[PDB]
Structure formats: structure tokens, C-alpha cells
UniProtKB/Swiss-Prot annotation, chain A:
Residues 291-308 are annotated as: L13 loop. This is Leucine aminopeptidase. It holds the Pfam family Peptidase_M17. It comes from Plasmodium falciparum (isolate 3D7). Zn(2+) 3 binds at residues 301, 303, 306. Zn(2+) 1 binds at residues 286, 366, 368. Binds 2 Zn(2+) ions per subunit. Two metal binding sites with different affinities are located in the enzyme active site and can be occupied in vitro by different metals. Site 1 binds metal with low affinity and can be occupied by Zn(2+), Mn(2+), Co(2+) or Mg(2+). While Zn(2+) has the highest affinity for site 1, catalytic activity is the highest with Mn(2+) or Co(2+) and less with Mg(2+). Site 2 binds tightly to the metal ion and can be occupied only by Zn(2+) or Co(2+). Zn(2+) 2 binds at residues 281, 286, 306, 368. It comes from the Eukaryota. The record marks 293 as: Essential for hexamer stabilization. Its cofactor is Zn(2+). Homohexamer composed of dimer of trimers. Both the identity and concentration of metal ions available dictate the extent to which oligomerization occurs; Mn(2+) and Co(2+) induces oligomerization, whereas Mg(2+) has no effect, and Zn(2+) causes irreversible protein aggregation in vitro. A peptide binds at residues 281, 286, 293, 306, 366. PANTHER family: CYTOSOL AMINOPEPTIDASE, LEUCINE AMINOPEPTIDASE-RELATED.
Curated annotation (Swiss-Prot), chain B:
This is Leucine aminopeptidase. The gene is LAP. The lineage of its organism: Eukaryota, Sar, Alveolata, Apicomplexa, Aconoidasida. Changing residue 290 to A: 6.5-fold reduction in catalytic efficiency in the presence of Co(2+); 854-fold reduction in catalytic efficiency in the presence of Mn(2+); substrate affinity is slightly reduced; impairs formation of stable homohexamer. Coiled coil: none annotated. Binds 2 Zn(2+) ions per subunit. Two metal binding sites with different affinities are located in the enzyme active site and can be occupied in vitro by different metals. Site 1 binds metal with low affinity and can be occupied by Zn(2+), Mn(2+), Co(2+) or Mg(2+). While Zn(2+) has the highest affinity for site 1, catalytic activity is the highest with Mn(2+) or Co(2+) and less with Mg(2+). Site 2 binds tightly to the metal ion and can be occupied only by Zn(2+) or Co(2+). It catalyses: Release of an N-terminal amino acid, Xaa-|-Yaa-, in which Xaa is preferably Leu, but may be other amino acids including Pro although not Arg or Lys, and Yaa may be Pro. Amino acid amides and methyl esters are also readily hydrolyzed, but rates on arylamides are exceedingly low; L-cysteinylglycine + H2O = L-cysteine + glycine.
UniProtKB/Swiss-Prot annotation, chain D:
Homohexamer composed of dimer of trimers. Both the identity and concentration of metal ions available dictate the extent to which oligomerization occurs; Mn(2+) and Co(2+) induces oligomerization, whereas Mg(2+) has no effect, and Zn(2+) causes irreversible protein aggregation in vitro. Aminopeptidase which preferentially cleaves leucine residues from the N-terminus of peptides. Also, has some activity towards tryptophan and methionine and to a lesser extent towards phenylalanine. Has very low activity or no activity towards the other amino acids. In addition, cleaves the Cys-Gly dipeptide, probably as part of the glutathione regulation pathway; cleavage only occurs in the presence of Mn(2+). Belongs to the peptidase M17 family. It comes from the Eukaryota. It is found in: Cytoplasm. This is Leucine aminopeptidase. Disulfide bonds: none annotated.
Amino acid sequence: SEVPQVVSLDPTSIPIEYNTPIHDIKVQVYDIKGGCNVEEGLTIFLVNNPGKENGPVKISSKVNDKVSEFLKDENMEKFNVKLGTSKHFYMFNDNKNSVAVGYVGCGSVADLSEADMKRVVLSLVTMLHDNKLSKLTVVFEINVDKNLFRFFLETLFYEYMTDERFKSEYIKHLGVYINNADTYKEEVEKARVYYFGTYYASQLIAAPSNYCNPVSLSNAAVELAQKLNLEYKILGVKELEELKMGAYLSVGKGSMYPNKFIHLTYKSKGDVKKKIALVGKGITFDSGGYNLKAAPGSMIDLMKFDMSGCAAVLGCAYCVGTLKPENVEIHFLSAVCENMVSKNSYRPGDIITASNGKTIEVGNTDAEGRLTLADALVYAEKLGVDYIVDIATLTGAMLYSLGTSYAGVFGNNEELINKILQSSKTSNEPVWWLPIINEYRATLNSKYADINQISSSVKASSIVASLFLKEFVQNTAWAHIDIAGVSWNFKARKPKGFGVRLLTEFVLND
Amino acid sequence: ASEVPQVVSLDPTSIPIEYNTPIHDIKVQVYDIKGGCNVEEGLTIFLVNNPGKENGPVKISSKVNDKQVSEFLKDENMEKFNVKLGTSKHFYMFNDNKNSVAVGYVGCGSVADLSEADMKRVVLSLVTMLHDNKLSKLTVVFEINVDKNLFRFFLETLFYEYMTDERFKSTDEYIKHLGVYINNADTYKEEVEKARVYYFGTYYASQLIAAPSNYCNPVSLSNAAVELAQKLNLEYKILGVKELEELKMGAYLSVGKGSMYPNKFIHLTYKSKGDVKKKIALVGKGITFDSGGYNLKAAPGSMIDLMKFDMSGCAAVLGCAYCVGTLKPENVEIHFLSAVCENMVSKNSYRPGDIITASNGKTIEVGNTDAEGRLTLADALVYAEKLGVDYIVDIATLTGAMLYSLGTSYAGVFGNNEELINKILQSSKTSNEPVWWLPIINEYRATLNSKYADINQISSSVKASSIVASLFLKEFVQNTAWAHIDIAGVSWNFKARKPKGFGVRLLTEFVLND
Amino acid sequence: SEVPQVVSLDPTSIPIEYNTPIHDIKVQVYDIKGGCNVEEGLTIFLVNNPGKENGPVKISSKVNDKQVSEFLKDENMEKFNVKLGTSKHFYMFNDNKNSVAVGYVGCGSVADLSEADMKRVVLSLVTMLHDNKLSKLTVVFEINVDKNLFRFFLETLFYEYMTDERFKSTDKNVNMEYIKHLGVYINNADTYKEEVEKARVYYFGTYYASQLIAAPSNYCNPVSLSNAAVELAQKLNLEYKILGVKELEELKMGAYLSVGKGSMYPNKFIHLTYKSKGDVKKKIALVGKGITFDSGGYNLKAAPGSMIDLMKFDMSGCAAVLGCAYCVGTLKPENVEIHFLSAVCENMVSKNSYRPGDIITASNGKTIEVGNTDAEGRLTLADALVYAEKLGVDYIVDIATLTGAMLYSLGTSYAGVFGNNEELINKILQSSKTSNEPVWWLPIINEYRATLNSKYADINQISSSVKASSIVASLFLKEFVQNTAWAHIDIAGVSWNFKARKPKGFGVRLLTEFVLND
Amino acid sequence: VNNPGKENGPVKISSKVNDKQVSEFLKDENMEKFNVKLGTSKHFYMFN
Ligand SMILES: [Zn+2]
Ligand SMILES: [Zn+2]
Ligand SMILES: [Zn+2]
Ligand SMILES: [Zn+2]
Ligand SMILES: [Zn+2]
Ligand SMILES: [Zn+2]
């Protein structure tokens, strides 16, 4: 638990902000029914137009200030609903008080996608990032699901929150005019919780590899655990050795940082109707090892993110510990380590031995993720759970298959896959089912070991990796969410925290 | 039918096609296992498994109508051999008539329900027993459960794998009969001729794909489709450059500018003789060589020597024309399409950057001349939709990225309509040509926003090419249920070094079941 | 015969210089025993010190001049050593009170100078002649050389001295004057005298080859090159025949014709024949790869190190053959009949080009699946070899810039020879030794044959698994010779002198010694 | 076994064998069903 250092100026912990300004926002919801007040700060109307370009903006809600003149149709026609196009204006109201008033365009379609709502929020955040306001209020002139409302809120909080921890003001009030604002009120605290789980995950991901390394990551998780009263355990090298976690130990052989295997457990208040284990890939930095990420495209500069799976698990723990779902036992697991080049590193060609006794021929040391997951997956399975769900920035191939938006889920059990897809729906974190194609299993037949780590022929890498992992779950329903492609936001230069909400929604729904 | 232009008089002017294959001469007889097996001339093979017991012993359970053969195949003899999948053994013995018989088995493993890929393995083992053995008869005894579709798949695969394509051999004996013993033989009988047609559909597609690009060019490919149409009584229109310009197919015409072969757009039509209740357009990418154009395929792994196969879509479509025209399904009108052209590098080629106008008036900014299939498909889809069909299904070797997403064993199906997608997946199950449903992610659409044209041909940010190509193709279908099958990954069998003829059975099952 | 043009400024012939200044040099050999007259120009001593690594210069020849003998006393020479390629210049007045330039080039301490050693010597000697205005050079051999080496010295001096200025316009060298006389002093002079005009013919044959290789692809294309061949034959009284496309079609040379499909230039197959008066004892076909430009085709030479800018040299094989024709036509050997074919064409990217994957049919009926369009050399040679074999010949020797792999195996000094007959290969290694053009014997490893098994055609052009591509290409060519002793010299690595940025003219001497010494 | 001259020629076994069943199997009429293409093999189980 002390972090080793090369020089005294090496950080020895990950800075985390738990108490964010976003927690300092008092939120109230109101029925668009009763009309809208414009007493203070910034008022935005979310508007669309079926049959557009988009067409003009028309406000439909009645407003309790003669602001009404501004939002009359002569002036609003000058503005259109093209998705994400916004305008806001300052003006005085019935009190000669300063009000700011505007709109965000919501396209032509009256049902809105995960990604369109994102574009909506980004535009709204833009406005908040450049205006000092005590208050913002939001008027929904577009239909939205209870889930999507939350998503809007979550996304608003997350996108609005800025991470300043490595650099050497916010609204205090959010008001919302919806409609059946009773149906919705309850999404508010969930949103806020989901925001933090997400944001927290993002604090870990964004934490560079020199702050966030196996030891610091393990201390943080223990601290998180402590705050939620989750049971915690950090297996160090000696117990990982006793446990013969050789694939896992092999990957970290090269690091100055001892392997740390995080095991957090959320025992449930209820009757124990599902033991579930969430297993995240925690490579705190992936050099690729001796198969160094040197090829144009390999993105060595981003490989602090290769623990995104682990962070997503941890952020999910935050949400679970907080919202306190009933009837579920949950295990939060991650084989945390670093993939480094060294005299001590495992080599291409090494035959290593997983904790289940499977010998594995390493054909490429940058495929280290499935090696550590193999050992965690046996550990998970030994727990006697019903469901194992792992989540990993496992394969560059994701980017060529589903790309940066949707993650793929592979599995050995249809009904588990289905519970993941439905969590996808309600978490509004897009996941798509991908097959484990058994025809490819032959390409893992080592000549010398029991199994190859990688195929040399097949290029469907995400599929071979799933097939590899599948060899390490004997008897338990298991799904593997590969987030290599979706985890970092390339346009915005930051983690999405992808997966926290989806995993939480998953333990909440099933 | 047009003249194939030539540079030299030695340039071939048609695709050689073999219609009467040795497989057609095979007499197939199906017998019910309950009557026992006669084991005489040829090679008699048992398909045996042992469920649950991995590599378990061979036990022959069918009655054999020969005391010497029964003696040889008693459990005590057979238990020393095992059912490991694809394992095989040959036996030689004298039957009750003092006649030498060859018997054997192919292990079918320890899983009750064989998968398409398992059965391929079995068939491959079986075919190695047919190779290098001058046999007049093979008899195959099913001691494994298969449904009707798998049984048919067994025969198609057998026929297909057994057949050897020797059209291009110059300087470098098939069974005549095939017995099959299986339980409830009478229910399987009807798959036999179906399998025979499917085999040829596929094999025919395969001959076209395997045909090299000097043989199989736009003129000779379309001529082949005309000929096929004439043999099958399908209607046909081949649209040439003049008619294509008139139709304003500037996407399709641009790709072909750099070729010595004029574009030729194939429109085969099968109409049913009774009231037509569904109209379907099947559209295949038909790029008879894809050099990549100015975006030349030069990078390692780009496989420019396999690029004759960039008309696999069109082949699957034509092979489906064969199956449909042969089986004559009712109440349906099918249009078989394929904007055929060749993507070459020339003073006349279209360029990266060129802005081109499709037949629906949409302008396209070309980012990469090697993303040419989507452009030819664009105008095909516009054409297809002007036919006013209920469904448009395209099949194309569109994106190399398929090799990185689903690999070489499962094609991707995208579409704008779930019902149609489900019908394609249904057809996947029953044809046993595996397809997986992949999303058209609307969030990527903005990366197709061109600063100058209505739309970009390619995304400059999104590496998910199959999805982005799909999204592009979707811009060219206004109002019709449409699906798109990316077979780039699966069309060519790298291990066997031949085409699969993939899609033919799939498309045919689609047309037949719906 | 008419060379097509795209614009009127495109050259319609290779410019060829036949009367080179080297031809105007009167060469006299004298016996060293009678002493050196030192009366004008430059007198160079070739001097060694066998044993003493960089030992001193000590002149051994009597010099018939008090003053020049004084200057060359041991005392005065000691400051200088014999390091291979070292040289010095001296200036003095002879007995006739005339200014006289004298010098030496060091030939090292190994009494047996190798090809590459003698080349360094001639190189040093040529630097003494460049940047100087001299009417006469005399060279004094104070080293031991056999007759072949003496000839090689002369051939090399001539070749290296000659400067190719056909493409200079505004930048012709104001300062290139050539000696008009060359005197040679050697032991047993009479025995070396034969070698002078042989050297002179050998030099021209190789220079001629060199001019064709060095002519860029817009000057040297398949029509200009074959027009040059015809002119050469005409000047030498050789029977010749240029097969054009219609005849190549009738001959079903589909492999050859496919390679040239993409070219704005019609394929032209050169066939020249030299026949002895009297009994023809040996009949030989010499086949030269003649790709006048090799883009690689649709497998374009785009990768780093593919040296596309050099690909004018892809007709080096042809050039060697044609320089051989020059030597053979000039020296008129007895009891031979030599064919000097050359399936000439250009490998371009076009709507008309052949494409990877194409299956083409060679003139012997064999179908070939093209796997890479930049393996065109073997395709043209396949048909050239069928044609050669049908001539009823005893030996077919091809020479070809076939494989860049040659740079990884033997590099830039030694060519590789492969073949189907040990005696033929040994005759090649025998002519290699007497021409001083180094060749090394490499194996046709039959084990790699299976990788040319095509699924669809009779044979693959290329291996998709074996990287020993000089061997594979030999395997392929072997398929086109049924029943004739045949060897293949792969000069991809040695044809171009990278250090001097010009052709070596590699092969002419080798092919000539081969033809002569039979 | 080989077949000199005949590319992919028939299998012909010359050795005399000490068993009448295998002798039968090895008769020319059965063995010509097979060819000598390098590496091509067949083998059959029987009772002696
Ligand atoms: Zn890695
Ligand atoms: Zn990794
Ligand atoms: Zn392309
Ligand atoms: Zn293409
Ligand atoms: Zn080449
Ligand atoms: Zn070449």
C-alpha cells in the first residue's frame, strides 16, 4: 500500500475530488403545466420541430412574465432548431431584473437518441461554461422517457463538471419545467449519483499512469470502499503467488509496481437472489511490453486509459453502494497491474500458467489484458456467482467494428447478454451483441501450450480474445463488454467513464 | 451481349463456365435406416458420434444386412476407434457374397447438435476419403441427428467441396452414385434436389469469383449473366454507358471511367406465373477488379491479388438467380441487379476529391477511390428503389474492416428495417450461411457531412468503415425496407484458396421463405 | 519501327555513341626488359610490395632517362607507400629538358590482385587522368598479371575513363579531353599484345550495354531499343528479326504479351543471330530480360527501397545480350551459332495493364496465375525461354535484373547463377573467372516448388510463402525449359553501380567469354 | 511405393505377403484405385 517512487517528486496517490460543485446544485422539478417563472439566471427551452432543416423555433409553454414578448413568434422565427444550434439572450424582466433566456435545437424527430441528447447537452453546457449564473432552469418542450431525462441530467452534470486536479463559479440552482414532473423527480438523485460514479470513473481514467498505478489505484479503491462500507480486499504479490495467478503475475513482472488485485464486495440488504461479479481490466499503463505500441495508430500516449474497465467497475461500486440495490450480492474485481518493458518483463513466446492450470503461450505481450482477465475470471468463478460481467479496453479492433460509440458485448449465455442489452437501453450507454464464433477456436491451439493467447491468422481480434476468455469460465454465465473503442472521447479529450451506468443499471434491473 | 474489348488477341473474351458438372451426374438414393444397410461396392461411411463422451468410442447402431460386415462392425471391434470430430478410418472386409467391401466412419464428435462449422469439418473429412480413391459409389449412413436444413447443407457442402474447378488448368474420376441411409428418409428426400440446385448456385457463383479479372470483366460478367438468363428464361436488360448516362448514374459511371471495359448494369428479372405478392430487389457489388484506383491498394494486407473477388456480391446474386430460376418460387417478382465495372488507375480514372452526382441528384465528395463499391451501390439502390419493390437486399465485399469485426465465418447484415433484417437472419439459420446483425450508428452520419458536396463518400474520423459505408448506402434508399450484407470477410476462403460462393444459399432461402 | 510519342518533344531514338574517344587511342605495348622512355604526358608505375603491408615504393624498371631515373631513386620514393589505390604525381624535366609527368598507383601487398583490387587500381589511375590535360598515358606494370587480368585492366580503364554525356546539354564538361596514346610496358609484352583489341572490343560491348541501360525510359523504350538492336545487327552483319505483336500473338506468347499490355509501346522481341562460317559445333541462345521501365504495374513500386527511379535498368539483361552481340559480331568466333533474343517491353499502370490475379497462358500452353505484376521479368523470360528452346539450341543462358532479393543474398559485387545443368553452370563460373565478372552459384531448391502450385492455373508466378524470391523465380523459369541445359544469371544486384551512379554493363564480358571459350 | 514415369500413376504393390486376406487387398485391381502422388496415403483396417 505505500507507492514506490523513483524520485521524491513522483506522486504517491491519485488526487480525487469527491465533493464536486455539482453536488452543490439544488435541483427542483415543476410541471410545464403551471407555466414558467423567469426570476433569475439562465432559462433554456428545449425545442424541436417535426418537418424541419430545421424549421423555426416556437415556444409553447406559457411564461409568467410579459419575458413573454421576447419568446413571441415574430422574434423566434429568426432562429431554427438544427440539432445543437442554440442562442441565448440577456434582458430585463418584469422586475427590471437581469434574466438570460434562450433555446437549444432538438432536430426534427420527437423521439431523441442517446447521441442527439448528448449534442443537446453539449450545447447547453457551452452556454453555462461562458456565463456566470446563480441559476439555470430548463424547459422541456420535447417528449422524454423517465430514463432519458435522467440521462440528460447525468450528461449535464458530467459535461458541466470540469476536472482541474492537474492544473496548477458554478450554478447553485437547477430548475426544470417538464410535465408530469411527479413522474420524474425520482430520476434526480439517481442522476446525480450516476454522474459521480461516471465522473469518478473518469477521474481514475484521466489520472495519468504516473499518479494512478496499481498501488495508488488499489489505495483509492480501498478508500472508496471504506467510504461506502463495502467489504474490501487487496491481494498482493504473495497471495497472488499462492493462488498461482501466473498469467496475471506475468503481465506485471515488468513493472516497478507490485500487482494489486482489487476485490470489493457489496453484500446486499435483501434475500441473496443473484451473486454477480464485475471484473474490470486494470492495466494502469499499457506499453504493450516487448510488443511495444510503436506503430502509427497504437496510441501509446493514451494507454493510461487501459484501466478504464477497472474504473468502470469501481464507479459502478460507487453507484451500487450508494443507491443500495436489494437482493444482489456484488463482487467488484480487478487484476490491477502495469505492462512495461524491462529486464523483468514477460517475453513474446513465454508459456505461462493460469490459476486454473491452463498453460498459455504468449504470442504478443500487448495482449496482456486477456491474460490478467483469465486469472480474474477464474477467481470470479471460484466465488460461486451467477453472473460474471467483465469490461475491458481489450482490443484496437473494436474501433474498426463498432467504432467510438457502441461497445460490444460477447458472452456464453444468451439471457445474460440480453440483460446487458436491456441495461444498455435504460443506461443509454450503447452496447451491441457480438458473436463468439467457435470456428475460430482452433487458431488458439498452441503447439506447445494448452492454449495460445492470440491467434496469428484471424484478424477478428475482439472475437479471438472473447474466445480466449471463454476458456476460463467453466460453468457460469459470462459476458465481456469490450470498451476499447468507446472509452476515451477523442473529440473532447477525456474519458467517457463508459460503463458505470450500464453496469449499475444491470445490477439494478436483473 | 457485347464484345469484350481486348488489348491483345490472346485476351480471353468470355468467362469459361461449367454448367454440367460431375456432381450433376451423381445418382442420389435415400434409404431409411430401419430397413438396414446394404454394404456393397464403393465406400460406405458411417457418420457416428458419442454424445457427452469427448473422443468416446465408435459404436455402429444401424443394422447392416450382411453377417460378415456386421461382425466387423460389432462394438468390440469399433470401441478401439474414437468419434473425435473429423477423425476417420477405412475398413476392408469380405461380405457374405465373398465380395471385398470398403467401409469406414467419420467421427462427428460428442455434441448432439452439430453446427454448420462442425458439419463442414465432417464433410471435409469425407471428401478426403473421396479424393485419391477411384470409387463409383459412396454411401453415407447417418447415425447422428440432423434436421432437414442441415441434411441439405450436408449435401451442398459435399457436392461443393467434392467438385474441383479446373477451367484454368491446361498442362496440369467422380463417384456416379451416392446412397444416403438416414431415419425417416422420406422427409429428407425432398432436400436432395434442393441441395443439388443450391450446390450449383454456389458453385456457379464460385466459378465467377474465381475467374480472374482478365477473364471476368464487366462485359464478360454481364454476358455471362445474359447467358444464364437465357438458359433459365429470366428477363434481362443490360444497361450500357449510353443508357446509364441518361439515367444520370454519375456515382456508378465515375468508378468505371478508368477502365477499358465499359460499365454494364445487369438487371435480371424473375417473375412468378401467379398473382405477385412480393417484389424484391437483390443488389450485388460487382467490381470485377478493384485496384483501389488512385487510392491504390499498395499497403501490406490490402490483398490486391485477391481483388477479382470484388464482384462476389454480383456472383451471389447471379447464383441466386440460378437457384430461383430453377426452383421457380411462386407469387414473387425478383430483380437481380449489379452495377458492374472495374476500378482502375488511368488518365481517365476518377480522382480522390472528385465531386460526383448520383442518379438521385445527391452530390458525393470522393475521399478515397478505393471506397468505390458504395458509389456503384448508391446508384444501384436508387435504381432498385425506382423499381418499387417491397425489399431491397444488397450483398457486397464492401469493407476490409469486416475481417476485423466478424472475421471469415460470419457476414454482417445492416439495414433500416428490423422485419427485413430478421428475415435475413432467418434465411441465415435455414441456409446455414452465418450472418450477424450489425448496427447503422446514426451518430457517425455527421462525419459524412461534406463541406462542399451533399455528402462524403468516406468518414475522415470514424474507423468503423463497415458501419460508415452502411450509413452512406442508407442515404440512397428513401422509402423501402432495405438490408445490406457485407461479405468482404467471408467471400474468399483463405485456407482452401477458393471462393465460398457465400450468400447464394442465403439469398435463395430469403426469396423462398418470404 | 516508328516510335510512338505523346508530345513531339519525346525522343524517337536512343542516342548512341559508337565512335568514342576511347577508339581514337593508339595503344602500344612494349617489353619492360628494354626500359621506359619518358618523354611526354604521364607515366604511371603500377607497383606493389609483396608482404610489407603499406610498404615503400621501389621502382624496378630500368628507365631510359638520367633525370627521371634520378627522381625515382629509392631514397626519393621512401616517403610513399603502396597501399592499394594510393597514388602520387611527380613533375620533372627529362634529359631532353622537357617537362614530364610521372607517377605511381599502389597495388598493395598481395601479389595476386583480385578483380576488385585491380578495379581500385584503375579507379585511382582514372582520377589522375580526369582533371588533367594529357595527350599520352603510359602505364608500367611492375606487378604480375595474367593475360585475362591485363585485358580486364584495359577494359576497365577504358570503361571508367569514358564519360557518358549524351544527356548533357547546358552542362557538358568543358574540361574532358582524352589521351590520344596509351603505352604499356610489361614483361613478355608480345604475349599481352593480343589482349589490346580484345580489351577494346570488350570495352565497347560493355559501354554499349551501359549506354542502353543508362538511357532513360523515355529514350529507351521497347521500340527504340529494338531499333537500336536492328542498327547494331546491320552494322555487324548479323541476321536479325524483330517480332512485333501480331507475330507474338501467332506464337501465343501470352505471358510476354500480358506484361506489355499496359504500355503505350508495342512489345518487340529482338532476335539476332550470329553464325560461324564452317562447322557449327555449339548453338547457344542468350536471353536478356528487357523491361525498359518497370513501374511494378498495379503492384506498383511504392514501398521504401523499391528504387522506382532506377527502373530504366530493368533492361540490363537485354543490354548485356546486345553488348555480347557486339563482341561476338566483332570477334567472329568459329564453330558457334548464337541467338541473342530479348522479349522487350515496358511494365506500366494503365487501363490496359494486366492485373494481379490474372491467369495468362504462356506459349508452351502453361497457365500462370499472376500474383504480383512486378514479377513481370519471369513472365517475359518464360516466353523467351520457350522460344529459345524451340530453336533447338544446346545452351540457353538468360541474364536478367530479376530479383531485388539478390541485394540481400550477394549484394552489389557478385551476380547469382542458377540452372538445371552442372556443366553449363560451371562453364558460366568458368567465364565468370576469365571475364572477371564475379558470379556465384545459388541453388534451385526444388523443395520450394510446391509453393508455386496454383489452385486454378498450372503454376503461380510467385510464392506467397517462400521469401527466397531469387530461388523461386528460378524455379518458375525452370518450368519453361523442358530438355535443354539452361542457366539463369540474376544481375538485379550488380547491374547498377550505386557508388558511381551509372551502369556496370555487367554480363557482356561474361557472356562473351562464355561464347568464345567453349 | 512409386510409379516411375507415370505422374500420379496407379499404386502397384510387388512384394509377396504371408497373408491371404492382405494379399487380396494388395491385388493390382484394388491398389490401382490409388495413386503415388508424393505424400498421398491410404490405409485400411482388416482381419488377417
Ligand atoms: Zn495491451
Ligand atoms: Zn491492454
Ligand atoms: Zn475498393
Ligand atoms: Zn471494392
Ligand atoms: Zn518487376
Ligand atoms: Zn522487372
